[PDB]
Each structure stands twice: as structure tokens, then as C-alpha cells.
């Protein structure tokens, strides 16, 4: 046993951080060495975008679109705020 938190893939120094993806999101982990394991945290991307699973189309952070839903029509807007969220609002015309 050698002092050095080893990740499920590569070994890094004590309290060292590294970029690793989980299922589909890139989270940077912070090893602790030992039974403390390592904690991952969502990393800040560069191509912030907003995807609409309602029409299967993609938009960029700071864009808007009009799509119907539930016998109605929602003017969903694409946001980001250093993250990447999708705000959906109603707008029956």
C-alpha cells in the first residue's frame, strides 16, 4: 500500500484533482487518499448549449424558440448562467 489516492482509472497525488466523466458529464474529482475516496464535481464547459428533448433540436446559450406542448404552446427559452439550463414558459397566442 502506497500513499496516493488511486482513481478507478489512473492514480493521482494526495488531494490531487483530475477531469473524469460519469455516464456523460465531465466532473473533476478531488482524491483524499484512503477510505475517504474521491468526490467529483461538474466541470465548467466551453460550448454552453440548451437541448430540447421536445423537438430533438439543439440551441446555444442565449437563444429562444417557440414550441407547442400539452395541447398548448410554450415559448421555451434557452439559458445558461455559467451552467446550461432550459427555461420553459407558456405563451398561448
Amino acid at each position: 500500500s502506497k500513499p496516493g489516492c488511486y482513481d478507478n482509472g489512473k492514480h493521482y497525488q494526495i488531494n490531487q484533482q483530475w477531469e473524469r466523466t460519469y455516464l456523460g458529464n465531465a466532473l473533476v474529482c478531488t482524491c483524499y487518499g484512503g477510505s475517504r475516496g474521491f468526490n467529483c464535481e461538474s466541470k465548467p464547459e466551453a460550448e454552453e448549449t440548451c437541448f430540447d428533448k421536445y423537438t430533438g433540436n439543439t440551441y446555444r446559450v442565449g437563444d429562444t424558440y417557440e414550441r407547442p406542448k400539452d395541447s398548448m404552446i410554450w415559448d421555451c427559452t434557452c439559458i445558461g448562467a455559467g451552467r446550461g439550463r432550459i427555461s420553459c414558459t407558456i405563451a398561448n397566442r
Binding site: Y22, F38, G84, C88, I90
Partner: peptide
């Protein structure tokens, strides 16, 4: 006009834990 906001992926924190591959 009725706001809703279903968000997307507000941050993400895991806690992967695994022992060392040794002691056979």
C-alpha cells in the same frame, strides 16, 4: 404566459469509492 422551467443539470457531485486491487 406561465413560467415553468424544468432546468437541465444543476451542477453534479459524485462519490465514487473503491478499494485497492491487491491482497490475492
Amino acid at each position: 404566459s406561465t413560467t415553468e422551467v424544468e432546468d437541465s443539470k444543476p451542477k453534479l457531485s459524485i462519490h465514487f469509492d473503491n478499494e485497492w486491487p491487491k491482497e490475492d
